[PDB]
Design a protein around this ligand. Structure first.
Ligand SMILES: Nc1ncnc2c1ncn2[C@@H]1O[C@H](CSCC[C@H](N)C(=O)O)[C@@H](O)[C@H]1O
Ligand SMILES: [Cl-]
Ligand SMILES: [Co+2]
Length: 243
């Protein structure tokens, strides 16, 4: 049935995502957001590469299976891929390893883990591709805390999320074709739902941050529509740094 903007299934976020990734690992099923780098991080990198100090470590926050992480590691001297899911990192460590990548478990909803990481590496820059929009609204402040801790004063963060129009976009597919995309259903099977992240959310969760640059555009999925084009929901992106 139809996706809701407000109402959502109540989940344990860590558990739901590990269930999804373990199912993905075991069964080798498609991953909705796992677009080839040329349509993903290659599009992102020009938006932040001239703004990040490359002497800081780079964190791929919520790195999933590491597809984007591998590319980042070809451009930055030191990359750390963080994810809540051990199965995600098991795929990453097999398919997307490099001498200058470390994959490490971390739960963004437990800010003490971010504190531990920052105590080891200092201020880090952050790349985050769709790490926020699916987080239940009532848990978002915890993730903001984690991010604030990792960035400190000198770090900058580029994030790209599903933006305003996300739910309408998916519901129009449902209306036009009678079901949601297979690859989206694969995630929703676990109680996970896509959501919306906006400029107003940057102010809400990061009032102590400056927006260096922002925009909208499209987010690239691997779901092919009947005309042969890929489904591309609306995106919101920003580069932010502590004021
Ligand atoms: N609480 C949390 N802490 C850290 N990562 C989390 C998290 N909740 C979900 N995630 C991770 O967020 C990712 C969203 S899917 C996007 C993955 C990756 N950035 C890419 O673009 O390919 C998943 O890998 C999921 O396991
Ligand atoms: Cl939770
Ligand atoms: Co502050």
């Amino acid at each position: 049935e139809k996706l809701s903007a407000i109402k959502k299934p109540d989940i344990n976020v860590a558990d739901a995502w590990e269930q999804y990734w373990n199912k993905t690992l075991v069964n080798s099923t498609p991953v909705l957001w796992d677009a080839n780098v040329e349509r993903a991080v290659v599009v992102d990198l020009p938006r932040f590469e001239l703004l990040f100090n490359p002497e800081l470590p780079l964190i791929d926050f919520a790195c999933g299976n590491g597809t984007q992480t591998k590319f980042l590691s070809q451009f930055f001297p030191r990359v750390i891929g963080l994810d809540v899911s051990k199965s995600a990192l098991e795929i990453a460590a097999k398919e997307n390893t490099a001498a200058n990548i470390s994959y490490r478990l971390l739960d963004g909803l437990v800010p003490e883990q971010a504190a531990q990481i920052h105590s080891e590496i200092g201020d880090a820059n952050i790349y985050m591709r769709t790490g926020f929009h699916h987080i239940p609204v009532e848990k978002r402040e915890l993730l903001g805390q984690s991010l604030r801790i990792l960035l400190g004063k000198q770090g900058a963060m580029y994030l790209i999320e599903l933006g305003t129009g996300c739910i309408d976009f998916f519901n129009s597919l449902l209306e036009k074709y009678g079901q949601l995309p297979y690859e989206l259903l694969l995630v929703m099977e676990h109680g996970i739902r896509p959501g919306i992240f906006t400029a107003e959310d940057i102010e809400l969760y990061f009032p102590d941050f400056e927006i260096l640059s922002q925009g909208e555009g499209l987010f690239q999925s691997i779901h092919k529509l009947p005309d042969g084009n890929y489904a591309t929901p609306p995106a919101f992106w920003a580069v932010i740094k502590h004021r």
